[PDB]
């Protein structure tokens, strides 16, 4: 692409991950600072022991009490946010039960006392977590009916946890009157707040009882330990130690004297915490599993490790591998900083997500919908359709379509009422277009509105562009490949294919085009098509059969892909310039490359377009058949995402013929048993031409920066529960993807309320090379490191974009106003009145709000100058038509004469209507002495229609009637 440079060609998209996790070594958490202040104030008013040794013991006890309160309050703060974080936490402490070195409570190891002490400390940790969970359950049960905001609920939770430690602090600090006074003031403030929130006395008493039970766990464990002389059997009998963890520790003590694909698959398969999952994080960070667990158990140490020795690329890879959804978060600071790392397009949504994630998801969906409402397409669909001709008015469908009437469908759907104004709904409901046209437009509206689909598209484009940028040659057509990527995405979602499986196909072809059919599965069933189950290898072989270093590149040069590449090139070179020089006509490029230029076909642009189309078609083929258990649920959800209750109008196709016919219907080329080439060229391809120029705002933003839009799924990795209840939740059934060994994680959505309550989330690392099955991470220093996952994609892109050319594949045979747009919106006794030769029709139609076509034109958001130009062009067209019908008969057919006469009489009647309406508008204009374009907006500012205006004249109406009668006289003759 020479109509650019090496500058602004790579800057069009961004792919480098930025680092936003910051934690200096001198930083303290909010809970730590609050507890330090409170315990300092308690210490200033303590009761010093009367003997020095007892004073030293008391000082040690007070420091320990501060540490334990910090631990309990931090754990309670974590549990209050995400309840499931308990299970990921305790299961890890159960994993490290006995041999944890770094426990905050404690400031060849043959001493039984030290081993017992460590064991007892870990048991105390687990019992404290269990107590906090019980208190959380009690709190939820009490707070279910009161119904206050989530922020207030979490604040009350934290305050109750803090207040529950009053007896412990009173006794530890010596029951001094000052300590009791401070704690009484705090308790009184808490009681006032709780009573204000609606709690009664019994609920407050129960909550305080549970909190005080939570805080007394550590001293209870220490008393147990010291009273029995460290008898592990009796401690296990009392029920303080988990049986499985204690058994594992005993086995470890008595015993004391592997590809990444397997461990990653095991980690993804289980929703609960898996110790082998840590091993996965071991590979990405060059760190032992035990060290990673120790850092995880200490929040500040974990933040320091993340911010110092781990790069942004490693964090992105780890999050996109689903690791962060299973590694426990030990402090709210961890969650907040991880939220800060995954930057959404607008930081304020991340700010809302830190406090209340549900409101943040709602605000994000609202922002997407709002940007959809004012987008470049939702306002000018009707205007552009009736001008370029790819939209057919409802009255024209009656006589225009002998057979293509079955291929025409209206634009408006049920849910469109919730996007556009009701007056614009009337204009949109009068338009009929091709079925593929309507599906493509609905899909373009769907992708740019839903957070889940937009995130999936952003992830796919991020992967494609970040693997394109590292190739020096292939980086020169990033905008072209992105435009084709988006067009194919819209087409695929229009077909009804599973959008979220697009990455999978992107790998599959990338494997085949590199490896051959051997890189597929022949031994287990893949998809049910025809009358029997067909394996993946056989399915792809039959796909290639019916369709039409690196081995299989020649498979891309077939009959079918050449026409598709030609269509893509036509769309690009029509809506913009050529992909080579910029200044070049729409038809000259394709004509030159087709009728001549031997051995110069399949340009790099054509090769990339054919590659993309092949990958989308493969995705559609796998997604439109009856698949196995894992993919069936994802396909069903993707079909249920569609706005209309019926785009699913049985696209579950069971035999090859129907599916191939459907795909050929939604993939145009030319010729084919398909309606005609002319209809395709007059009503379908101009739509794609316009769509290439009218992409929505949100799609352009996501394609500009895709990391910010995959940040939605990255966020939902951290908190993915629903506000309503926790009864329906079975995300484990969808994650059991046995079809492929690719690192793509499909999850469900629970933050959205409607209607994406069952949305799908795609997790796909942006550094995954499908050909060599390696992850290309960037180290903190700056050196790329390849990690095994059990001549990569950049080599394939370089070989796709080289100077090598193919030699005459298949055919290469030869090359394949505004007034009507104004007229297209025009809409019993009426027909009998105006059937033929009638004049009273004017006196029966001049009045009427439904007949006010100028209102429809204004609702189309058409400029006043454009309306004037359309009126003048309609006048000129009618002037030409009158003489060409009366005195220039090419075919003096009675039926044609009558049809054209009725058409021109209706056009002249609309001309009179808009003459009166525009004279009225000019009268109002000169009455309000206002600039014109402002008034055009002002019309919707006052929300006034033309009906209430009564600027009667007496000369204007007379001359208008005279000229209209003069116009219609010789027409009727």
């Amino acid at each position: 692409s020479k109509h650019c440079g090496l500058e602004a060609n790579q800057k069009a998209t961004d792919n480098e991950p930025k680092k936003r996790i910051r934690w200096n070594k001198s930083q303290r958490t909010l809970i730590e600072k609050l507890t330090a202040d409170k315990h300092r104030k308690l210490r200033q008013s303590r009761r010093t022991a009367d003997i020095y040794g007892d004073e030293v013991s008391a000082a040690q006890s007070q420091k320990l009490a501060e540490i334990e309160e910090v631990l309990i309050r931090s754990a309670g703060d974590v549990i209050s946010l995400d309840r499931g974080q308990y299970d990921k936490w305790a299961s890890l402490v159960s994993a490290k039960l006995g041999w944890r070195r770094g426990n905050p409570l404690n400031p060849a190891l043959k001493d039984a006392r030290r081993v017992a002490q460590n064991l007892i400390n870990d048991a105390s940790h687990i019992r404290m977590l269990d107590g906090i969970k019980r208190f959380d359950d009690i709190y939820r049960q009490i707070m279910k009916p009161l119904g206050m905001t989530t922020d207030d609920a979490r604040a009350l939770f934290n305050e109750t946890i803090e207040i529950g430690s009053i007896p412990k602090n009173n006794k530890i600090y010596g029951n001094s009157e000052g300590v009791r006074l401070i704690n009484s003031l705090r308790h009184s403030d808490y009681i006032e707040r709780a009573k204000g929130y609606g709690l009664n006395d019994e609920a407050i008493e129960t909550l305080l009882r549970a909190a005080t039970d939570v805080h007394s766990v550590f001293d209870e464990m220490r008393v147990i330990a010291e009273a029995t002389g460290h008898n592990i059997e009796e401690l296990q009998n009392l029920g303080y130690f988990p049986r499985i963890a204690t058994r594992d520790f005993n086995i470890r003590l008595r015993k004391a004297l592997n590809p990444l694909s397997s461990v990653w698959q095991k980690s993804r398969k289980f929703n609960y915490f898996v110790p082998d999952d840590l091993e996965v994080a071991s590979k990405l960070l060059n760190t032992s599993s035990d060290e990673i667990a120790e850092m995880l158990l200490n929040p500040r140490e974990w933040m320091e490790f993340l911010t110092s020795s781990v790069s942004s690329s490693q964090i992105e890879t780890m999050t996109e591998l689903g690791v962060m959804s299973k590694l426990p978060m030990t402090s709210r600071e961890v969650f907040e900083q991880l939220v800060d790392q995954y930057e959404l397009p607008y930081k304020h949504i991340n700010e809302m997500f830190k406090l209340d994630p549900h409101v943040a998801a709602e605000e994000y969906a609202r922002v997407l919908r709002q940007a959809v409402g004012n987008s470049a397409m939702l306002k000018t669909v009707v205007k552009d359709g009736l001008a370029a001709g790819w939209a057919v008015p409802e009255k024209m469908l009656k006589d225009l379509s002998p057979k293509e009437r079955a291929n025409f469908v209206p634009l408006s759907f049920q849910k469109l009422d919730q996007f556009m104004s009701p007056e614009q709904l009337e204009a949109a409901g009068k338009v009929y277009v091709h079925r593929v046209v309507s599906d493509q437009w609905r899909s373009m509206l769907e992708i740019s509105m839903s957070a889940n689909k937009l995130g999936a598209f952003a992830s796919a484009w991020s992967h494609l562009s970040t693997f394109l940028n590292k190739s020096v040659l292939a980086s020169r057509n990033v905008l072209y490949v992105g435009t084709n990527f988006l067009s194919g995405f819209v087409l695929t979602n229009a077909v009804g294919a599973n959008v979220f499986t697009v990455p999978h196909a992107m790998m599959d072809i990338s494997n085949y085009l590199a490896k051959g059919l051997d890189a597929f599965d022949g031994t287990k069933p893949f998809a049910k098509i025809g009358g029997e189950w067909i394996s993946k290898r056989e399915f792809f072989k039959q796909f290639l059969l019916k369709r039409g270093s690196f081995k299989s590149i020649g498979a891309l040069a077939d009959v079918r892909s050449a026409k598709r590449a030609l269509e893509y090139l036509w769309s690009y070179s029509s809506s913009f310039g050529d992909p080579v020089r910029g200044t070049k006509g729409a038809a000259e490029y394709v004509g030159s490359l087709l009728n001549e230029a031997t051995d110069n076909f399949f340009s790099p642009f054509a090769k990339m377009a054919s590659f993309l189309d092949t990958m989308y078609k493969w995705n559609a083929y796998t997604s439109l058949v009856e698949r196995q258990g894992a993919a069936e649920l994802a396909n069903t959800i993707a079909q249920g995402m569609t706005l209309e209750p019926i785009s699913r109008i049985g696209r579950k196709f069971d035999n090859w013929r129907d599916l191939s016919r459907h795909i050929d219907d939604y993939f145009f080329t030319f010729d084919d048993p398909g309606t005609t080439t002319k209809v395709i060229s007059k009503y379908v391809r101009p739509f794609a031409n316009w769509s290439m120029q009218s992409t929505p705002a949100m799609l352009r933003a996501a394609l500009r920066s895709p990391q910010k839009f995959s940040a939605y799924a990255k966020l939902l990795q951290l908190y993915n529960r629903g506000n309503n209840d926790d009864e329906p939740l079975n995300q484990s059934q969808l994650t059991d993807w046995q079809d492929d060994e690719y690192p793509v994680i499909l999850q469900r959505d629970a933050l959205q309320t409607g209607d994406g309550n069952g949305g799908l989330l795609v997790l796909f690392p942006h550094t995954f090379d499908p050909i060599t099955d390696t992850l290309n991470v960037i180290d903190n220093a700056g050196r790329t490191v390849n990690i095994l996952f059990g001549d990569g994609l950049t080599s394939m892109l370089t070989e796709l974009f080289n100077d090598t050319y193919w030699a005459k594949p298949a055919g290469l045979l030869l090359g394949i106003p505004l007034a009507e747009a104004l007229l297209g919106m025009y809409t019993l006794a009426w027909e009998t009145a105006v059937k033929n030769g009638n004049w009273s029709a004017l006196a029966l139609m001049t009045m009427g709000a439904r007949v006010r076509l100028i209102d429809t034109a204004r609702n189309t958001q058409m400029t006043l100058d454009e309306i004037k130009t359309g009126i003048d062009e309609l006048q000129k067209a009618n002037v030409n038509a009158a003489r060409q019908l009366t005195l220039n008969p090419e075919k003096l057919s009675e039926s044609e004469r009558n049809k054209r006469t009725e058409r021109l009489t209706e056009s002249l009647t609309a001309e009179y209507q808009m003459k009166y309406d525009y004279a009225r508008l000019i009268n109002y204009m000169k009455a309000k002495r206002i600039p014109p374009k402002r008034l055009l907006f002002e019309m919707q500012q006052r929300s006034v229609n033309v009906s209430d205006l009564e600027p009667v004249g007496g000369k204007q109406r007379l001359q208008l009637e005279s000229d209209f009668r003069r116009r219609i006289e010789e027409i009727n003759k």
Binding site: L208, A376, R700
Partner: protein, 1071 residues
């Protein structure tokens, strides 16, 4: 009046008794008035809501065990581990919880209530999961080295204290702090912030200010005798040599002959010239203001010099005033060094000569136990009090004083307060050889008292008609004193001198007051003959500025410079030992950990400090309060008058310079000024505010508006207030606990001694009888209005009137409270009065002398008259020899006879009571009086039996003090009585009872102080909570406003960006 009790008519009539029995309704008056009669009509269980909710209240119970003493306390307060085990085991036998790794159920608040609630501690259990600089041991080693016979020599080896793990929390070794810097941070939040930022061998002699005794002997007449070591220094005046010197023998100094005579009150006299360089010559002050220097005349000021030139006949001691050269016949001075300076030890006791008297210039005690055996008990001092006194009381405390007898005021003398006082004849030196001085009014009053005393002596001599030589010498002494009152004539009216302008400071300020707990610890080991100084116990709450001024006065012993710079204003805001902005922290930083006296002097509770007195260039230190015998001994003392990162960089660099040699010290003052600069930084600056907010202040209270910064400043200030009040409360509570323990110990110890103290005995008043050498003057202290020598008293020796040779003992007896038994008998009581008597004795029996026949006859007659035949025979077998009438060999003195009587009485505890023993001794005294014995005396205490043998002369009034001073006086009297009569168990029992009473009174005072401190603590804590709440509210409002503004900005940016990419896509390659 007819309604003297302010009662109603009926009630008043009933009180008078004027209502007959017939008109009285017995039931109504029985139910109304008060001569009436009276008539009486599962340990793991879930805690009850009342019990659980009582754990959060500020005042859940009002139990008061502070005044419940258990002498036999078996304190074994231990956390009930077995009970906790029982509760845990019981809880685990309930319905098992499900859905948790731990299967056993939860005890709803039972465990927290049992482990932490009320009706070897838990901290010991929690401390089983984890060196100190012992100051006391090092101090003991240093003091033992000082006491060693080779070092210097009065060696008293201090015992070894208990281990630091068992030492008392208020002991000597913990005055510099607990030494817990490694475990805990300083209690101040700003101190924590600065610490996090990194910006934070003759020791027995202490110099306090910036750079003997004479005995009296009954003579053929009055003697001023003197321990003879020679004069370390003869108080000369070499200013003017040769002539105009007399060198009076009595004063042991040279006086001037009249041939060479060629809103502060001080500021008022000088009219504002108080700067140390702008003082005006003294002559100008005299000329300008003569109404304060003249005897209310126009122009005839004349300092008489003829009197002091003439040697005093009969060696009368009249301290001559400080000499003055300029005589009135009808200019910025450097002020240095106009006076000679010397060293004076403040801890030495001073016994100056008696004014008006002649000068000749040239342990074991018997205790009766409960079972009835009078075994001896060697008296000893416990190691704690020994170490305390060796660290504070026994050390040498020296001061730079003005050498008055060698000083003279000249024409060019600056208008110093001492100069004004000397020129106005306000201060006069008293002791010949020391710089001790006294106000002139005191000397005049002493001269008047001696005049009256010897006038009555002359009257008695006239009545007896003694030799004319004695009469003539007494007449000469009387005339000499009368002349000395006016100093210049015999007919001149007596003169009155004005108050000296030099301010006075009590010496305890420079010596240190002992806390009540330490005083009771000393009292636990009753030592006969000891005295408790009332001014060493009187403590008053000080202020930070007063301590700052005191350190500005006191110099650093290591370097000699003042402890605090003269320009260092408001360097302290805290009293805590663990803080960083406190005198203890500053002294530790200076490295003065080996000087517990400095730590004591700068404590919050000490002696009163007057800032003005320390501000003056010269001030008086009072060494001993005035007495009817001796004037108030005083001495005169002369005073010789940038960001956080940058500060961290210099502090790091300054320590690095230590590694090299540099200069001799080169570091102390620079580091001190740097650290002061760090101390007094401002918070409002954005850098300091950011550092503090990111170090200590939580994130919920972060802000930048003026309101948030002001609230942060207020929070820090109220935190300092909380520090101060909490420290005060903690110290008072520790003192209260120590006093309670020591009082219980004292009660347990006194419970082993038999009850033989005669504190309910009322002796009948002594009836009157028929009725050349000059004896001394005896003193009697009493609170009875209308006292005569015949009132008598109850004591160890028996009935009679007790008189004391030493005025101190009589003064102590004057302030002691009237005995409770005697209070119900004495009709009227008045101010503490001291009565003069001159003894007139015919025969006197010594108590520490061999028993004569008359005493044995009186003893036998009394025993025969009072005791029965069997009792008499038992007494004879007990005290007399089996075969003879002569006394036993072990019994040789009347004191031993009294001890034997006490032992015999205690043997038969059933039928012998203290009243009966005292009646027996009284009968012995009456028999002695019948024989013709006037009184019984050892040197000091005289038991007058015949009231006609003495005559009252004068009564001196004393100031009525509070309860604690009264108890201290009673203990002092009891201790002196025990010190004289060590062999009589009654004196020891009285001393023990007085000690216990004093301890109890001190405990009550401590309770009052603790209640005051607790009220202040409650106020401070409530204020701190209010400030924190307001700060949190304001910061949250600010943060919400900023966040909402950012959200609105983001939404507007989203609108603009969405409308920007919402027109068309017509750019070739720009997306």
């Amino acid at each position: 009046s007819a309604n003297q009790f302010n009662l109603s008519a009926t009630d008043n009539l009933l009180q008078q008794g004027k209502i007959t029995q017939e008109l009285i309704n017995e039931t109504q008056l029985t139910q109304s008035h008060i001569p009436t009669v009276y008539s009486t009509p599962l340990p793991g269980q879930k805690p009850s809501p009342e019990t659980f909710n009582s754990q959060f209240n500020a005042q859940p119970t009002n139990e008061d065990a502070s005044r419940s003493f258990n002498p036999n306390a078996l304190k074994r307060s231990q956390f009930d581990v077995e009970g906790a085990l029982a509760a845990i085991r019981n809880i685990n036998t309930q319905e098992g919880l499900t859905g948790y790794q731990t299967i056993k159920p939860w005890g709803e608040g039972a465990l927290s209530s049992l482990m932490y609630g009320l009706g070897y501690t838990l901290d010991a259990i929690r401390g089983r999961q984890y060196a100190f600089d012992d100051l006391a041991e090092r101090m003991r080693q240093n003091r033992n080295a000082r006491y060693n016979a080779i070092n210097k020599t009065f060696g008293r080896e201090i015992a070894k204290p208990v281990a630091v793990e068992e030492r008392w929390s208020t002991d000597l070794s913990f005055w510099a702090g607990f030494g817990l810097d490694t475990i805990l941070d300083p209690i101040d939040s700003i101190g924590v912030a600065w610490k996090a930022s990194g910006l934070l061998t003759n020791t027995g002699r202490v110099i306090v200010t910036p750079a003997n005794k004479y005995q009296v002997v009954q003579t053929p007449k009055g003697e001023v005798s003197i321990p003879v070591g020679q004069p370390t220094v003869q108080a000369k005046l070499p200013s003017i040599a040769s002539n105009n010197k007399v060198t009076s023998l009595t004063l042991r100094r040279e006086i001037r002959r009249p041939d060479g005579v060629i809103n502060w009150r001080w500021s008022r006299v000088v009219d504002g010239y108080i700067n140390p360089e702008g003082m005006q010559p003294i002559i100008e002050v005299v000329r300008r203001k003569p109404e304060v220097f003249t005897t209310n005349s126009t122009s005839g000021y004349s300092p008489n010099w003829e009197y002091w030139s003439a040697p005093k006949v009969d060696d009368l001691y009249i301290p001559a005033p400080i000499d003055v050269e300029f005589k009135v016949i009808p200019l910025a001075l450097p002020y240095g060094e106009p006076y000679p300076l010397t060293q004076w030890d403040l801890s030495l006791e001073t016994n100056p000569p008696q004014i008006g008297q002649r000068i000749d210039n040239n342990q074991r005690r018997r205790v009766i136990k409960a079972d009835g055996t009078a075994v001896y008990e060697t008296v000893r001092v416990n190691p704690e009090t020994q170490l305390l006194d060796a660290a504070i009381t026994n050390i040498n405390v020296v001061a730079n004083v003005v050498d008055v007898p060698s000083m003279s005021v000249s024409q060019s003398t600056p208008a110093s307060p001492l100069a004004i006082d000397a020129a106005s004849d306000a201060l006069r030196p008293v002791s010949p050889g020391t710089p001790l001085v006294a106000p002139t009014s005191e000397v005049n009053k002493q001269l008047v008292d001696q005049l009256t005393r010897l006038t009555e002596t002359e009257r008695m001599m006239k009545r007896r008609g003694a030799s004319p030589e004695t009469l003539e010498r007494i007449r000469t002494q009387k005339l000499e004193l009368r002349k000395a009152i006016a100093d210049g004539d015999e007919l001149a009216e007596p003169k009155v001198k004005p108050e000296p302008v030099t301010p006075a400071i009590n010496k305890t300020v420079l010596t240190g007051t002992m806390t009540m707990s330490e005083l009771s610890q000393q009292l636990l080991d009753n030592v006969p003959g000891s005295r408790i100084d009332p001014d060493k116990v009187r403590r008053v709450e000080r202020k930070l500025s007063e301590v700052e001024a005191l350190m500005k006065v006191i110099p650093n012993p290591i370097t000699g410079e003042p402890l605090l710079g003269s320009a260092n204003t408001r360097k302290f805001r805290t009293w805590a030992k663990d803080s960083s902005t406190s005198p203890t922290a500053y002294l530790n930083k200076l490295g003065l950990q080996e000087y517990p006296l400095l730590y004591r002097l700068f404590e919050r509770d000490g002696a009163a400090i007057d800032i003005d007195a320390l501000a003056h260039p010269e001030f008086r230190v009072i060494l001993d309060k005035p007495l009817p015998d001796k004037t108030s001994r005083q001495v005169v003392v002369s005073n010789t008058p940038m960001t956080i990162n940058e500060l961290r960089s210099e502090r790091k660099l300054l320590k690095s310079q230590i590694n090299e040699l540099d200069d001799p010290s080169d570091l102390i003052e620079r580091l001190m000024e740097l650290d002061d600069a760090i101390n007094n930084l401002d918070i409002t600056k954005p850098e300091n505010l950011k550092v503090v907010q990111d170090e200590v202040i939580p994130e919920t209270q972060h802000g930048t508006s003026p309101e948030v910064v002001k609230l942060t400043q207020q929070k820090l200030d109220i935190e300092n207030e909380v520090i101060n009040t909490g420290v005060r409360v903690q110290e008072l509570e520790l003192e209260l606990a120590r006093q309670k323990v020591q009082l219980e110990d004292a009660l347990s110890r006194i419970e082993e001694t038999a009850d033989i103290n005669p504190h309910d005995v009322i002796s009948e008043p002594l009836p009157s009888g028929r009725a050349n050498t000059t004896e001394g003057s005896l003193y009697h202290g009493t609170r009875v209005k209308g006292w005569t020598p015949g009132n008598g008293g109850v004591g160890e020796w028996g009935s009679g009137t007790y008189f004391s040779k030493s005025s101190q003992a009589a003064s102590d007896n004057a302030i002691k409270p009237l005995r409770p038994a005697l209070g119900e008998v004495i009709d009227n009581v008045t101010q503490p009065t001291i009565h003069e008597v001159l003894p007139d004795f015919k025969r006197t029996v010594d108590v520490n002398s061999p028993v004569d026949g008359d005493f044995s006859a009186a003893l036998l007659m009394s025993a025969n008259e009072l005791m029965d035949g069997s009792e008499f025979t038992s007494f004879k077998r007990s005290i007399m020899k089996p075969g003879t009438v002569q006394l036993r060999d072990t019994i040789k003195t009347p004191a031993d006879i009294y001890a034997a009587i006490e032992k015999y009485a205690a043997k038969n505890d059933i039928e012998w009571t203290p009243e009966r023993t005292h009646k027996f001794k009284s009968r012995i005294n009456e028999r002695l009086r019948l024989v013709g014995v006037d009184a019984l005396t050892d040197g000091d205490t005289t038991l007058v039996i015949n009231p006609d043998a003495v005559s009252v002369i004068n009564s001196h009034l004393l100031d009525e003090t509070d309860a604690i001073g009264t108890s201290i006086a009673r203990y002092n009297s009891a201790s002196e009585a025990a010190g004289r009569n060590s062999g009589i168990p009654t004196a020891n029992a009285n001393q023990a009872e007085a000690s216990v009473m004093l301890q109890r009174q001190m405990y009550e005072e401590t309770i009052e102080k603790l209640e005051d401190a607790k009220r202040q603590q409650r106020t401070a804590i409530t204020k701190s909570h209010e400030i924190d709440e307001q700060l949190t509210q304001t910061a949250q409002a600010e943060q919400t406003t900023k966040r909402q503004q950012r959200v609105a900005k983001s939404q507007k940016r989203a609108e603009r960006e969405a409308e920007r990419l919402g027109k068309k896509r017509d750019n070739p390659c720009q997306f």
